[PDB]
Design a protein around this ligand. Structure first.
Ligand SMILES: [Ca+2]
Ligand SMILES: [Ca+2]
Ligand SMILES: [Ca+2]
Ligand SMILES: [Ca+2]
Ligand code: NA
Length: 397
């Protein structure tokens, strides 16, 4: 419709500012005390019946040998994962496809790099204990660091896995990231090879238990091996983990129709129509929505999604970030933040006088009739206003 596709335009623009304002990548820092790196990241797991389970990761990497290593400046890795099932497999199993790419240093090789120039066989061995429920996982596949590509099949060798597969993905080889030519001096992971590194994590599942991991990642001959011990404590008997309430698969399906909604939202930011979004342009939309960021914040927000590191959001970089932002569910707190962009008085209801103060402050002419058509489209209980539960309907597939 002509008032339906005025929701998507305004809604996508807000979800996009949401994405630009959060921290979704794997942030790496030098740790000179340990001759190593530290990392941290927020992972999302879709809850089958709706909502999201967050898993907050802290990470530490330590060389096994005394060789010199590369200690990087601050960057991040960007990871895209697809989970699938092997149709001829009786055993509890996971087929995993990962792409891993290093970015985050805008445009201004160790001996280990050389072991990754081609396709490297991969072996993974995990022993686990969560709340006393013990399990082992075996995996095999191969990695191509040229393209940051990993393929792996994993078996549960103990029978039924006591936790959902998706919760083990982060634990079950960042030495296969594609690093740009300008960032090769920052690849610690390959630098440690072949003697290897210790990778330790702690993973906090919000409102539930935590995992502790210790892994040896090294060459055993010509194979890259990941040997992992995992311990989980304090999990709820009927939480999302132990009660197996998380989506396995997470559809990867952007319709032609959705891409086109992304473009219309994109064009709100790209006011000069040159196919990219500058700090100036991002700033302009955000001031117009109340917020008032610095040049420094805008550079950081753009850096979160700047694949090519040119200091702008290219249309493709935008399509990518919006794709991700539809694959994984937002938190209540994130949707709340979205709502408050419309809900200026904080009373918990979007008036028709609130929707306009957004729309005519975002450079849109519209009669006090098409406004009322917007409200009507979203308003189920009929009060002529938009409450939180109503908003949450507008902001979904
Ligand atoms: Ca532009
Ligand atoms: Ca760019
Ligand atoms: Ca209000
Ligand atoms: Ca209502
Ligand atoms: Na163990």
């Amino acid at each position: 419709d002509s008032s339906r596709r005025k929701w998507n335009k305004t809604g996508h623009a807000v979800r996009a500012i949401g994405r630009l304002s959060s921290l979704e990548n794997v942030y790496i820092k030098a740790d000179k005390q340990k001759n190593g790196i530290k990392a941290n990241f927020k992972h999302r797991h879709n809850i089958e019946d709706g909502g999201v389970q967050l898993a907050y990761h802290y990470q530490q990497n330590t060389p096994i040998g005394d060789g010199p290593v590369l200690l990087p400046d601050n960057h991040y890795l960007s990871i895209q994962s697809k989970l699938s099932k092997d149709p001829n497999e009786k055993r509890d199993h996971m087929v995993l496809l990962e792409f891993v790419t290093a970015a985050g240093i805008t445009l201004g090789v160790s001996k280990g790099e050389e072991l990754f120039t081609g396709v490297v066989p991969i072996l993974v061995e995990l022993d686990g204990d969560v709340n006393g429920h013990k399990f082992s996982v075996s995996g095999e596949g191969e990695g191509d660091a040229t393209y940051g590509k990993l393929t792996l099949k994993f078996i549960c060798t103990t029978g039924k896995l006591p936790v959902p597969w998706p919760t083990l993905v982060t634990t079950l080889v960042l030495c296969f990231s594609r690093y740009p030519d300008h960032m090769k001096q920052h690849d610690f992971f390959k630098s440690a090879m072949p003697e290897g590194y210790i990778q330790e994590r702690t993973i906090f599942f919000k409102d539930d238990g935590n995992y502790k991991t210790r892994a040896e990642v090294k060459f055993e001959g010509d194979t890259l091996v990941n040997r992992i011990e995992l311990k989980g404590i304090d999990f709820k008997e009927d939480g999302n983990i132990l009660g197996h309430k998380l989506e396995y698969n997470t559809r990867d399906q952007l319709t032609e129709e959705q891409i086109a909604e992304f473009k219309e939202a994109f064009s709100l930011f790209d006011k000069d129509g040159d196919g990219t979004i500058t700090t100036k342009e991002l700033g302009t939309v955000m001031r117009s929505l109340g917020q008032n960021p610095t040049e420094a914040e805008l550079q950081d927000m753009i850096n979160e999604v700047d694949a090519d590191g040119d200091g702008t959001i290219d249309f493709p970089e935008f399509l990518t970030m919006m794709a991700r932002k539809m694959k994984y569910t937002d938190s209540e707190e994130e949707i709340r933040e979205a709502f408050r962009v419309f809900d200026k008085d904080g009373n918990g209801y979007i008036s028709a006088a609130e929707l306009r103060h957004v729309m005519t402050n975002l450079g849109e002419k519209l009669t006090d009739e098409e406004v009322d058509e917007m409200i009507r489209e979203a308003d189920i209980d009929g009060d002529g206003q938009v409450n939180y539960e109503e908003f949450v309907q507008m902001m979904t597939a």
